[PDB]
Swiss-Prot record, chains A, B:
Family, similarity comment: Belongs to the Cu-Zn superoxide dismutase family.
Gene designation per UniProt: SODCP.2
CC cofactor: Cu cation; Zn(2+)
GO biological process: removal of superoxide radicals
GO CC entries: chloroplast
Protein name: Superoxide dismutase [Cu-Zn], chloroplastic
Catalysis performed (reactions): 2 superoxide + 2 H(+) = H2O2 + O2
Subunit structure: Homotetramer.
Cofactor: binding comment: Binds 1 copper ion per subunit.
Function: Destroys radicals which are normally produced within the cells and which are toxic to biological systems.
Binding residue positions for Cu cation: H46, H48, H63, H120
Compartment(s): Plastid, Chloroplast
Coiled-coil residue windows: none
Length: 153, 153
């Protein structure tokens, strides 16, 4: 079975983007990211708890964390469901990349439809940074843009 | 066992707003609307099919219609699930209103999480307008603002 969703990223900056998600059944979720206006380099890219955009990107809450674990890299055992790792922005400030993930379904109890995708200001340290923020946010800095994950055909 | 959702309405104009939704169980959904910058008068306010905002408010598709019926008023029998009727904008351009509805749940197959709320430019004619558009859009005109329905605490 095929389910699809999209997120339009906007924020208090010049960062804009589109993200599409698709999955079939218990399958993994394929994530296609295109974001422009980023500073060249690595950027944290996470799926956050809430699709609330009232008070800017902050209302989206923390990283989606159904298994109540600590922050990690996508390939780690111990990680938040929403830890998608880093996005690389090229010399033109554009990040295009396709990710695959197990922990962000489009159906079921752990569905991420109606939650948020956020692109961050700094590199995500994947938990291994030994900073106080390492085990919660990855020390990825402020929030550049976000969007609610909504349904598409 | 209470579910909650929110939608932040923006668009190609000067209309902005917040909408909050809540339901418990098979219960009705409560909708709290606050929209500013509207022209004084009646405005169509509908829940559309898709949370897609790629190409403005147009990507959100038509009125959410799981039962494949024609356009109607909220109290009719023959109506789209998304037909919430009209919103009244006072002399200052502000519409505050609390609606209750049966056909826009926050769980189950007919969930509206990840879909869109749209506020329209003209009065919704509730189907009884005998225009070609009367049975599909209510002839409510262009789309002033929309937002994706996302989860909150
Ligand atoms: Zn995390
Ligand atoms: Zn309708």
């Amino acid at each position: 079975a095929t389910k699809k969703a999209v997120a339009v990223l906007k924020g208090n900056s010049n960062v804009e983007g589109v993200v599409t998600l698709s999955q079939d059944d218990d399958g993994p979720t394929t994530v296609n990211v295109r974001i422009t206006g980023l500073a060249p380099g690595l950027h944290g890219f996470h799926l956050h708890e809430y699709g609330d955009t009232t008070n800017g990107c902050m209302s989206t809450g923390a990283h989606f964390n159904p298994n109540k674990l600590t922050h990690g890299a996508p390939g780690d055992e111990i990680r938040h469901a929403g830890d998608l790792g880093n996005i690389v922005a090229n010399a033109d400030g554009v990040a295009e990349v396709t990710l695959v993930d197990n922990q962000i379904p489009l159906t079921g109890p752990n569905s991420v439809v109606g939650r948020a995708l956020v692109v961050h200001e700094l590199e995500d340290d994947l938990g291994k940074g030994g900073h106080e923020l390492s085990l919660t946010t990855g020390n990825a800095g402020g929030r550049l843009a976000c969007g609610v994950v909504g349904l598409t055909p």
